[PDB]
Structures are given as structure tokens and as C-alpha cells.
Amino acid sequence: GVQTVTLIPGDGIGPEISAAVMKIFDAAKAPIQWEERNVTAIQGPGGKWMIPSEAKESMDKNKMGLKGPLKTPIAAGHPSMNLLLRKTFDLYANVRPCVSIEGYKTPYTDVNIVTIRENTEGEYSGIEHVIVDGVVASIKLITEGASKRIAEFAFEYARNNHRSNVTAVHKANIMRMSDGLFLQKCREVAESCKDIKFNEMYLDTVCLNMVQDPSQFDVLVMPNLYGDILSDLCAGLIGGLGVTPSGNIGANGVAIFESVHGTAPDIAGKDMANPTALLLSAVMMLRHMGLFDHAARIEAACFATIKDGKSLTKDLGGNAKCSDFTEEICRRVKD
Amino acid sequence: GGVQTVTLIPGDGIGPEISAAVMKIFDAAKAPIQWEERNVTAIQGPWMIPSEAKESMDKNKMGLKGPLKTPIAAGHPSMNLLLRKTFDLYANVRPCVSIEGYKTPYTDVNIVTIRENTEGEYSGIEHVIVDGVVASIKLITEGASKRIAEFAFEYARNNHRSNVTAVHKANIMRMSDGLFLQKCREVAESCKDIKFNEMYLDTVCLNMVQDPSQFDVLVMPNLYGDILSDLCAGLIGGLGVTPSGNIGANGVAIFESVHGTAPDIAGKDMANPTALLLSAVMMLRHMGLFDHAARIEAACFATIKDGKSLTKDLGGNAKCSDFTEEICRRVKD
Amino acid sequence: SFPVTMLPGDGVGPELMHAVKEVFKAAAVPVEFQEHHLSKLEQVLSSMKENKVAIIGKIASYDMRLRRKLDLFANVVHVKSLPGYMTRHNNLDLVIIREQTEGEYSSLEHESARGVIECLKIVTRAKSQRIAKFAFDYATKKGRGKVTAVHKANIMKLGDGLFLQCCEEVAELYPKIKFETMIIDNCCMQLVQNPYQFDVLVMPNLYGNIIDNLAAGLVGGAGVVPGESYSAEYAVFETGARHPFAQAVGRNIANPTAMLLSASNMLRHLNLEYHSSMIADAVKKVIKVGKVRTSDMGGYATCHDFTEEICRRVKDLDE
Amino acid sequence: SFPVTMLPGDGVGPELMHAVKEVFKAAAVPVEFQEHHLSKLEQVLSSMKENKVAIIGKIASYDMRLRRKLDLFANVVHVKSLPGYMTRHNNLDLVIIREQTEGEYSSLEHESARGVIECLKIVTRAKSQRIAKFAFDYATKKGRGKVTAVHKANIMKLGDGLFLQCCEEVAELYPKIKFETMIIDNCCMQLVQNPYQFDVLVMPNLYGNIIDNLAAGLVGGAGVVPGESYSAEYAVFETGARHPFAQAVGRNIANPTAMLLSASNMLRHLNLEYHSSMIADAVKKVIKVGKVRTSDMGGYATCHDFTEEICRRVKDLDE
């Protein structure tokens, strides 16, 4: 039947582009119902910030969320938005598929890379110690359960999206014990998935090769800090964060698909925002739900809308508005 | 019912004399014990303890260990560490009781220090952060702490002990020692037939020296037990008269003498078996042979209260054989 | 003249500083207490920057933060038998010297994994070389003969061996002082059998906590052992055994001996030798004649009574 | 002449070093290399004490053991397009300044539980200040106009926050140099998109490794990009991209452009400026004319073919 997805439009241009996805999704006859929610943290008992309950309950029920850019909170004790969500839903895999867009020129044209970043430990452990004045130790945390879990999803991802190879990216030569254990758990899963080709590379090698020739790469899986970086690198190869979809897969079947770009408060209200990023994230969501045929159409009908280039938005090297860009996609998703 | 073989590790120096003495006291008491000598002196493998000694401990679960030798190589690891990692020795146990023959400023001491033996400050993990700046890693885990507290309340029930004190420093190390206290509480509320309390290490040290009457069974993390046990030993006479057992997994248990190897009086007949013997008594109670244990124990104590035959270290001129054979006489009651 | 910072502290503190004031008043001591009812309050650094000395009671957490703002790195505890008070170890004279800014005391703890806690113990050359020079300078200034370094360097090879390494080097700069090392747990056992083998003892923070209270028990308890902490610039006078339940129960039952004694030690530091020895020996004689004793000493007198007696004999011209 | 210690190292190292000396012979470079045949260790430091300058291939870790004995704290990579060699970002000119002694690179790892590994990352005020002043000292000596500090201080608020703090402080003593700050993952995205927005970049160890090889990819890769590592006294010249498969080619395949350019930058440091520029110009011309290119630049030429072409064209400038 038709499934309900929790919609989190966010702030600034978020509403405008969430509206745009809702209309594009409607033209596709896509069996999708929206349930708006607001994730802005509130002060819970003792002042400990939290996601609102209706936000949590609705995600735990519908499982799928579509979430736009969020404002940066100003209170100092206030924890990171990404951190709150990650901990509230156990979002353990961050997924960034980067694909060269036919009509948007960059120095790279043959790019098709999916970076799967472990999203819960590594150097982002949140553990630091002031050892003595002027000397700080930041604890990087690697565990076998988390490294096994992330490697199992990369192979899950490659199987479900017909992906040829998976590369584990690491620095086991420098961090022998921690990155070695990550690379070890990758290897062990790699043997129970012999139908996906697997290999290892060093992070520094991957960055020098990434920029000489990105075609040589496919699905990549690495520890946290390395993914936070490589994913932005790879997004830099296809045109920035405005054309870059993002997924966060979590516990209990929960996945939240988001735009990684900012609120753009100066162009809010104006018909100037670009929805490509959030829309492409919505087709990430569709494929995640198994609505491959619907996703393929909305995807193929936005690539087309950019290829002919008649009406890009301000950022994409064009002069048109959010209405026209949206309307072209609606028209073409009907044939 | 049935004869048991106990691995015997006589060891070095006065080692083989005093373990030979225990052998014969056990004989005089007709105790159900056979012995199987072995050598735990570590060897350079591909350092490790020899496999015949490991297979013997694996089969016979009980060992009696005399005093070992301090290795000379700097790269040679702690002989206690090898024995601990081999059999997973997690509980170090020191029953200290005032010997009535052997006058001390402390006359009514009966304390059992159950020490966690696997983690704590003795985790073996340290880093040089920068030049002249070292960080030592103290580890406290949930499982290790529960396991040590579960032994302690078991030891208190089986050895008919009335109170158990968790000794900690959780006002300083609020997370690590805090977790240890947290699990001792959990076990305590499952064995509500034991009056359980908590005390700070520094309070216990201050009170121990002033009145040991007030203590009973003390369970505590590694370093605290390493220190608290030697402190209580001094209450009653020192390493020369204190038993000690290290309880391990797979039914394993090694009762040792903690005094030194005393090489200057090796060969001569001047060693004092009292310490290695009272550990052998511990081994029996651990094994279940309560009647052979109380007998041998009562023989040793009576031999000391008489004072007729005391070794050079308790204030006599008796030889070691004069001391043992008197004990052997008494235990044939 | 002479302004001195007073921090009464928590517990029975205020009643002991009351005793100090009454004995000082009895003795007509030229020392005016500028006191702060603590428990930012950088106020006390403001005051010590002028006064340079303090008398404090029981207080990372606040105590270790205060010591850090005053750089009170060296702690000195005097373990001396009082002639009237009889214990299992009499005619003992030890000095316990303890590093106070390092070790397990900066709350450097974290969770590696559910049920797995790490806690870092910090040892640095800088602070080990400093506490080591202080112990030997203490032995030289005070006529002591031996400095024993207490450690666990056979287990924590780095770190306690660092502390050991710095002691051994400093020991070569003081050829007239004898230098020994002993392993913490051995040392504790020796401290009960025969503490007489020791002169001056130097160690890092946690072993200092342990031996501070252990040695205090040898010669009387937490109510009679005084202590001090030093800086380069600052001298703070407290009690020796400051364990969590030191005198924490009671009211009008506390023993003022410990505080009074380091009060007199403080007067010695201000170069008020006349009042320092007057107060000191008043207290030592009230304890020896044995008329009034507080409950920790096998007596039945109140804190007020015991202090009323010290006062009575400070003022008694036929001493 | 001029003595310079040469650590050929492994892989193409001994071959790339054979190129430096065939080109130095052809240019009558007044330099005598003192060759330490294999990678006990302190003879290289005693040789470095007199010579003060080295040129090395590739070989804690072995090579980051060397960097501690010689205090090579500051690494510099010159990322500059070569006019003949077309990439996706031509006419680009950046310098990467990387701190090399702290961070993850000291193997401070352990196991706090079965399947739980901790790696410590170290950041100190000492070395952050030293690399920040180096970066501004670099920008003024060489006349660059901007220093961008790369960090991840929004997540690692200490540590990376302490690096940023120092950087911001030193930035104030250098008013005619512009100082921006950029988050590590955003900066990597900018390097592939608009690398022209940067000048000097200063960062800690791991980010350096990342940006070193990233930006070397912008301008033609590990075959052409020179690096150098300084201490306060010593200068050691190497290749810029130091990843494990940097030049994992067989005999007579590898591109000597990286080592030769860094060889010319050594000659400048030795104040042999005529020779430094003669060898630099030769390399750059040979590359621009296009007759002879190594495989990594497209052409079919061996390494001997390529460097003997350098030799011809540089004995000619010595007409």
C-alpha cells in the first residue's frame, strides 16, 4: 500500500524545498504520505536537551524520515544536532552517493562513488583529557562490534544497489591496533560476501588517487573521521553540497535522509532555493524503501531537467526560480 | 573419599625444605593428598611457564607453591603475572589471624583481604604522552568487579564470616572505583545474610593501625589489596607466617607462601614452614577437607604456643626438622 | 601585625579554628585572621598574594583546584609521638612528604565501552624532580639524615619509574643525605612492624594519601597529627590525616590537638618562635599530665574543656 | 665543496638518488654526498650535526624515529603546477605546512577490553605554537600573503581547539599576513573545487598527510611534488606525497621530477643559488617541451631516458 514518511522540513530554505519534494513526489504518483515533525531540541528534565517525543515516536513508527537543513543552535551547552539525532536513533552508518551530473560541469565527469562512513566512534568519541596544562589527549575509539556492523552495511548496500566492489579505506600502517582491528573486521565480513569484490587501500593513497581519477572507485567504507572527510572531498568532485544526497541508517530499521547543505537564510522566502539535494535524498529514500521504479523516474526526470539546462537555479549557474525548476521536474516525471 | 594429587611447586632457596616439611605433616595426618612436583620457572619460548606444569594444574586443580626466585633479566616479566595470566587468577586471598604463640602489638586480628587480581592500576597499560609525561591506565570493568565481589560473599558464607567491607576511593576516582562499588552493592543485595558496608582506603588504613578488631572480610580493587594485604600481614608477624591463595578459573587454585626464598639459610635446617603450611591448610578448606585442615592447623598453632621448638625467625633456636616433627607428633592426637 | 588567611572548612573545622583563636587569644598572639567562609573564589589567591600563609580546615574538585591555584605541590605531615599519649609505637619521628598536584587526582576518567572505565594516573618529570628536591631540601634544613622514595615501579615501570628516576638524580645533589627506595606495599608492612627504620619519606599523591593516614594511626590518630602544604611562595597549615571521616562526626567532641599543633607550626613559619613554642608545649603538657583528654585519646572531655585547659596553662606563670 | 648526508632509502629511492647525482655531476654542483647505505642509528645524527642538510628517500615507526632524533617538526610541501604537464588544476600555487611529531603518530594504543581499542591523539601548546610561528615565518620569508589553519575543532573541542587557539595567537604577531581558519573536511572539498583560494595552509599531523597527498594529486601526483622537513638547525629534503604506494614501480620506470626539484630546493638552502635555478629550469623546460616524459606523466620514457635528458639540457645552460 502507501507508506507514511516523517517529514522534517527544518529551517531557512528547508520548508521551500520540502514543499518542492512533496509536489514532485505527487506528480510521480508515488505512494508516499508525509507527517511533518520538528526536531529542534527542547530542554528536558534538568535542562538535558532532547528530540521532542512526537519526533521520536513518529520516526520509530514510520521508520523513514526526510529531513532538511537545520539551524545551528546558539546556546553553548547545547549539543550538536547531528549528535543528538545519531544518539537518539543509533544512526550508525552515514551514506553519501556521489554521481557526476550530466548537465552540471566540473573538472570530473566519470564519478560514481558511495562513501559509507562509520558514524558512532573513532576520533569522534567525545572523549578528551587535559593531561597537563598545554597537553591534550583525544581518545580515538575503535571497537569490533561497530567495525563489523559498518562493514555488514557496506555489503548490504552494494548488494541492494547492484554495486560491483567495496573498498575498505584505512591507516592501519599508522594506527596498527585501532585501524587494524577495523580493517580486520572488514576482512572477516568480506569473506562471507565473496559475491562482492573487496579490497583495501590507505587513506592517503585514496585521496591522491581520488583526485587524479575518481572512476577507479566504487563503494567505500572507513572509520568516522576518514568518512566525514572523504565524503566532502567526493561531494567536491560533483558540484558541492547543493547537489549531494545523504542518508543516515540506524537501529530498528530507522533511516533519515537529509540535505547536507545549510539553511541559506538570506534566500529564504524568495523563490531562489535549489531542491536538488533534498530531492535526490528522497530518491535515496525511495530505493531504500524498495520503490525502485518510482525512484528511477524522479531521478531520471531531474537529471533531464538539469541536462537541458533551460532553467537552473541561482546556485547551479542559471537564472530561473524554485517554481520553474520544480515545475519542469513535475512535467517530465509524467511521461 | 579418594586420593587427590596436588601440584607441588617447591621453588627455590628454603623452598624445597619447607614443602618437604608440609608433605610429611600431611603424611602424619593421613590426609588424602598425593603430590606431583613441578617447576614453574619460566623459559624463553618462541617467556612462558612450562607446559608440563600447565597440564598438571589443568588436571589436578590444586597447587601448593613455595617461594620463587627473582629473575635477573630486565626483559623477564613478573613471575606473578605469568602465573596469573596462565590460569586467570582473579582473587588473591590473605587470611591474617593473630598467632597466640607469637607476640605482636596486635592481639585480636582476624581479617580476610580478598583482592581483585586482574585489572585496577595493575593493568599493564601506560603511555608516554610527551617527554617526561607518563600516563598510567587504571582499568575497572563491570565483570571483573562483580566476579571479585561474588567470591567475597561466597568466601564469607562458606568460611562463616559475618561482615564484608568494600574498600575503595570513590570520592577521588568517582567513575572507576564508583563502578566497583556499584557492583559490590549489587552482589551485597543478593546475599543479604552478610552485613555489607563501604569504607575509604585512607579511613581503613587509619583504623587498621589503631584497632584491627573492627575488620573482617575486605574486598577491594587490585592496588588497594596489594597494599592492604601486606599491611595486615605486618599486624600479625609478617610474610613469614601468612597464608595466601590465588583463585582462578577452570577450578584452578594456587596456594603459596609469600615470604622470600631465604637463600642464606637454605641447606641448613633453619627454615620456617609455618607460612607454606598455613596455605596448605587454606588449600584443604578450599578443597573441602575441613577435618584434615582443622587438625593440621591445630597442630601447628599448639606447637607455637608451647614455644618449645621455634625457628630462628620466631625467637627460638630449634631446627626446622625439630619444629616440623613436633607438629607431626601433635597431629597424631 | 601579621595577617594570616583562615579557611575554616567543613566538618568540625570551624570549632577547631575557634580553638585556635582562643589559644592565640590566651597567648596574646600577634596574628589577625582574615578568614573566608568558602564552601569564582579567586579571593583566596588575592589574599594569599599578600598574606602568603594560611590555616585551613577540611575542604578536579575544590581541594585539588585550590591546591592548583596556590601551586601547593608539596605536602608535609609530621608523625611524632606525643609524650603522654601511649600507642603501640612510641618515640617515633617521621616526616611524610607527598606530591599533591598529580596522579589519579585530576578526574581524568572515561568510559571505553559499557562497563569499562579508564582512569589516567599522571606522573611528570617536572613535578617529580620538584617534590624530590623539596624532600632533600627538607632533610637539609631540618637536620634529617635519610630520604626514602616509596613507589610501585616494578608494576608501573614507566611512571613510577619516572618518579623513581627523578628521585635518584636529585639524590646525587645531596651527598650528605642518605637515600633509599622501598616498594609501597612493603613500606606499609614495615610501617607497622618497625617504622623506626624511616627518617623522611617522599612519594607521589596516592601513596601519600595511604601513608599519611597509616602513619597517623601509629602515633595517635587524625586528631593529633598536624600537616602543612607549601608552594614556592605559600605555606598552608592543615591537619595530617585528611581522610573522608577524619573527625567528621560530632560537635564539641573534636580534638583540637592537630590544628593547634600546626597552628604553632605556622607561628614558627611567621618567625613568631616565642608564641610557637608556648602554644606547642602548652598542648604537649596538657596531654602528658593527662588531666583532660578528648574521646579519641581515651578521655571524657569536650573540645571546649580541652581547649580551656591549654588556655589555662598558656597563662600560668609557674610553668 | 658542501657535505650533504644522503639516505637513499628503499624502492626507487636508490634510483632517484642516482638521478640527483647524475644531474649534479652534469651541473658541476659543488656538493659531496655522504651516503648512509642503509636506513646504530645515531651515526646519521652525528653526520647531520656537521652537515646540517640531508636528502632522503623513504624507508613509533622507523622513519618517524629519525624525525624525533633530528626534531624535524615542520614539514613543507610546495604544490606548484608545471607548465608543460596539464592536470585539472593548472596555474595553482600552494604550500602545505604540516606538524610532524604529535597526533596519532606515536603508537599510543592499547586494548581496554576484548575488542575495544584506544588510540591517543596528542596535541600540545608547545608544538602548535612552534608550527604556527613557522607557518607565518614561512609566509613572510617567501612572501606569501595568507595562512589558513585547518582543524576539526568543532568536534574535538580540546586538542584541535588547542591547535586553533595557538594558531590564532601567533596570527596576531603577523599583521601583514591574512589569517583564516577552515574545517578539515570543508577544506578538502574546497581543494578539489577551487584550490586557488589558498596560500599557505598550516595543520597538524594527520590532516597534513591527507592534504599532502590530496593536493599533490591536483598538480600531477607523487612523481613531481617536492617536500622538505625542517628542525631549528636541520633541513631534510624529500618528496611531498609520502603514501605507501608513492612510486611502487620497478627498475627504470619512476619519475625523478619530485626528487630533482627538491634537490634544487636543497641547493638554494645551501646558498648555491645559481645551481638551484639551473637544475630547476632544466627540469621545467624538459617537461614543457614534451619530448621526454615518464610513464606517470603520459610519455613512454624510462627514468634514465628522462634524467639524461635533464643532463643534456643543463650542461648546455653551463655552455
Numbering used by the authors:
A (entry chain A): 3 to 337
B (entry chain B): 2 to 47, 51 to 337
C (entry chain C), D (entry chain D): 14 to 52, 62 to 81, 92 to 351
Q: What does the paper behind this entry write?
A:
Crystals of the apo αMβ belong to space group C21, and the asymmetry unit contains eight αMβ heterodimers, which form four (αMβ)2 heterotetramers through noncrystallographic 2-fold axes. In the apo αMβ structure, the conformations of the β3B-α3B and β12B-α8B loops are similar to those in the WT αβ heterodimer. In the αβ, αMβ, and αMMgβADP structures, the active site assumes an “open” conformation due to the absence of substrate and/or cofactor. In the αMβ structures, the α-Q139A mutation eliminates the Gln139A1-Gln139A2 hydrogen bond. The intramolecular hydrogen bonds His131A1-Gln139A1 and His131A2-Gln139A2 are replaced by the intermolecular hydrogen bonds His131A1-His142B2 and His131A2-His142B1, and in addition, His142B1 and His142B2 form extra hydrogen bonds with Glu150B1 and Glu150B2. In contrast to the WT αβ and αγ heterodimers, both of which exist as heterodimers (75 kDa) at low concentration and a dimer of heterodimers or heterotetramer [(αβ)2 and (αγ)2] (130 kDa) at high concentration, the mutant heterodimers exhibit an average molecular mass of approximately 131 to 149 kDa at both low and high concentrations, corresponding to a heterotetramer [(αMβ)2 and (αMγ)2].
It consists of three types of subunits (α, β, and γ) and exists and functions as the (αβαγ)2 heterooctamer. HsIDH3 is regulated allosterically and/or competitively by numerous metabolites including CIT, ADP, ATP, and NADH. In this work, we report the crystal structures of the αβ and αγ heterodimers and the (αβαγ)2 heterooctamer containing an α-Q139A mutation in the clasp domain, which renders all the heterodimers and the heterooctamer constitutively active in the absence of activators.
